[PDB]
Amino acid sequence: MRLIPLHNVDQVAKWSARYIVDRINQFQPTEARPFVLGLPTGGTPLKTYEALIELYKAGEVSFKHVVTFNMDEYVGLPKEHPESYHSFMYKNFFDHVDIQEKNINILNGNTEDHDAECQRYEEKIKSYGKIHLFMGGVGVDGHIAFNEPASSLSSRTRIKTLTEDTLIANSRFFDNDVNKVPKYALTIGVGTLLDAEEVMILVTGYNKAQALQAAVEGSWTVTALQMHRRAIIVCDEPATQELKVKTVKYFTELEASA
Amino acid sequence: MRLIPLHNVDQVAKWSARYIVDRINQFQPTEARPFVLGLPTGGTPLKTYEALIELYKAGEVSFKHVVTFNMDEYVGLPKEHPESYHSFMYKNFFDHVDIQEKNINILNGNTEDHDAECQRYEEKIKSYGKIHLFMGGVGVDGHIAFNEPASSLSSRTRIKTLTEDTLIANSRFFDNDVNKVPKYALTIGVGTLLDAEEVMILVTGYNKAQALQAAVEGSINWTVTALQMHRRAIIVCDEPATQELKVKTVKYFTELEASAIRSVK
């Protein structure tokens, strides 16, 4: 596992966006051989998407032959609703880069069969082979996406009931009314994330300090990253408050070395 | 508890020596009212003694009315032996400062009764009231002086067997022979150290990082964790000793003690 200890959220956004762009330009995707990218939502990914747009506007990268898969989506909320994950991804990223609609994949939470929709997504992932880079966040309790904190490492795409903690957090997006937050969501599994060639986790904020410590130092779903072949965690200084001094010191020198 | 996170061993030596001198000059000791100082041995205390000698030669401090009590001493080893803690204290400190012979107190490991000698030592401490400042080190496993790892917090001065790990250590001082290291020592107890008004522990080196973590962050357990129940405990460390502490712990004490960090930077 690689830990990138940066100072602030802006540096985390710029570094993570630059890492994605560098890999896409190293890969050089085509119509026959696209670059497959897993994508999250939320406040911390939002700053990366803004930085990715800045690099696109600078002519530094093209998403024409980039295929994307998003982590999750609300059930029962129309995709046209402003607070859907479809709306988040288009409003904050897709509408500003040269991505192709047919290469965009976001789970549909309003199908005739939620179980069937989840398996279709898993098969669309397999049809491309593997995801080359899956970007994600972590929750305060170390949970990935909408998977339960204690999800099996083999878990796959499925429907989940939102916990009481996720409803009150996401309530700010729904007029500060917990009864307006969708009660269900479709979410990729932990096994779905680990099947990617690379996982990049963005961890910012004091409230994520225990999660980052569990991810980096502990033996908390995010701890499964320790057995992943190519795991990258990009954090800011407040997120490192629970790490040991020697841990931050070693990775701070390792990155300055590159 | 205070943690003084400094950069290197020299700064730990200079700061700890300056702290001792400042307290002595703040105390203003006399014959009737002496300053009582507890003293350890070893490589890390040695640099503090060297720094204290420079401050004495500069006219910054006098030890004329300072009474000292050492932590421990080997049993069965003559005090004149080069590896006794008598020889360590005189060669590296007492022979270079203006301390008075009658104000020096070191456990005698060759008396006719080890229990009586230890009780006399405790009584001698009590006759002065309290030790005003007890300087000490810590072992890699958190032990203090020669107290066993699971020593009682109320334990007093007594004769003790050196642990197997203490026996393999210190073997370099006795011809690289574990069988030639003295098997017993007289040592102050954990309660004896805790009775002092103030305790200052010197913690340097990567090998002491686990010990510092137990002392500063761990729950009371590691004899050094007994410092957490003391009224005024001070730990002076260098950067390698902090490697096992949490970032927020070093961050907190670097800002809190920023004036003490700047004084030797």
Author numbering:
A (entry chain A): 16 to 234, 239 to 277
B (entry chain B): 16 to 236, 239 to 282
What's the publication's text?
In bacteria that live in hosts whose terminal sugar is a sialic acid, Glucosamine-6-phosphate deaminase (NagB) catalyzes the last step in converting sialic acid into Fructose-6-phosphate. The enzyme NagB exists as a hexamer in Gram-negative bacteria and is allosterically regulated. In Gram-positive bacteria, it exists as a monomer and lacks allosteric regulation. The monomer folds of both HiNagB and PmNagB are conserved and resemble the E.coliNagB open structure with seven-stranded parallel β sheets surrounded by eight α helices.
PmNagB crystallized in the P 21 space group with 4 monomers in the asymmetric unit, Matthews coefficient is 2.16 with 42.6% solvent content. The structure of PmNagB was determined to 2.3 Å resolution with the final refined R-factor and R-free of 0.20 and 0.23, respectively. Analysis of the crystal packing reveals that the protein is a dimer. The dimeric form also corresponds to results obtained from Size Exclusion Chromatography experiments carried out in the buffer used for crystallization (Sodium Phosphate buffer containing glycerol) and in HEPES buffer with no glycerol. The residues in the trimeric interface are also conserved. It is important to note that even though PmNagB has 80% sequence identity with HiNagB and E.coli NagB, with all the active site residues and most of the interface residues conserved among the three deaminases, PmNagB forms a dimer and not a hexamer. In the Pm-NagB dimer, the dimeric interface is conserved. Even though the trimer interfaces are conserved, we do not observe the interaction seen in the case of HiNagB and E.coliNagB. However, the calculated trimeric interface stabilizing energy for PmNagBHexa* was only around -33 kJ/mol. Here, the values with less negative energies refer to poor stabilization, and values with higher negative energies refer to better stabilization, showing that PmNagBHexa* is unstable as a hexamer. We propose that Pm-NagB is the evolutionary link between the monomer and the hexamer forms.
